[PDB]
């Protein structure tokens, strides 16, 4: 219970960071997986 306390404390101090992770990672996974959908490859825009 004590080690769970310290783990949960470091998690609770960074609960806003967990929420930010979920928020900013749930809004681009479809967009990122879109590129590698056409075929057995992934498109790239080689600017140079």
């Amino acid at each position: 219970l004590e080690q769970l306390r310290t783990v949960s404390d470091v998690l609770n101090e960074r609960k806003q960071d967990l929420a930010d992770i979920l928020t900013v990672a749930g809004k681009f996974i479809t967009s990122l997986a879109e590129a590698l959908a056409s075929g057995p490859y992934f498109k790239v825009m080689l600017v140079n």
Partner: protein, 153 residues
């Protein structure tokens, strides 16, 4: 008796608020628990392999400090997915050799990873030969292309 009154009231309130929640959670945890148990063998090896590969995939993209290191060789690509047959599926199950697990670590002594075909509707299994692309030439004005789309090249 007074302490029993107070404790009984408080505990009854807490239990009445959080009892059905726990009951339905423990009822709904059966499929997730069975799934986690079924695919337990591929946990330690997966985490071990990711830990092993983390320094390498970190030094690859962090070695220069301003770019990424890649080895660029030209190759041919397969036929794009057809509409009805290659639709996404989420019916993947099992692991290598029919049961969940991991391959032994891939050094340079055994470099080619065995391709694992899963029930997803997309695969590159029959690419065992050099063949000309089925949509070899395509026109994007009237949508007419040379060759017939297929799933069996």
């Amino acid at each position: 008796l007074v302490a029993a009154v107070g404790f009984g009231n408080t505990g009854g309130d807490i239990f009445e608020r959080g009892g059905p929640y726990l009951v339905r959670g423990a009822q709904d945890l059966l499929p997730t628990s069975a799934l986690l148990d079924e695919y337990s063998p591929a946990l330690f090896c997966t985490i071990r392999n990711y830990h092993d590969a983390a320094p390498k995939l970190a030094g690859a993209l962090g070695g220069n400090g301003y770019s990424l290191l890649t080895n660029s060789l030209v190759v041919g690509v397969g036929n794009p997915y057809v509409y009805p047959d290659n639709l996404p599926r989420v019916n993947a199950k099992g692991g290598p050799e029919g049961r969940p697990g991991c391959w032994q670590p891939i050094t340079r002594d055994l470099w080619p990873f065995p391709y694992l075909v899963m029930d997803t509707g997309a695969s590159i299994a029959p690419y065992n030969h050099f063949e000309l692309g089925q949509p070899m030439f395509a026109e994007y004005v009237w949508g007419r292309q040379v060759g017939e789309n297929t799933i069996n090249p």
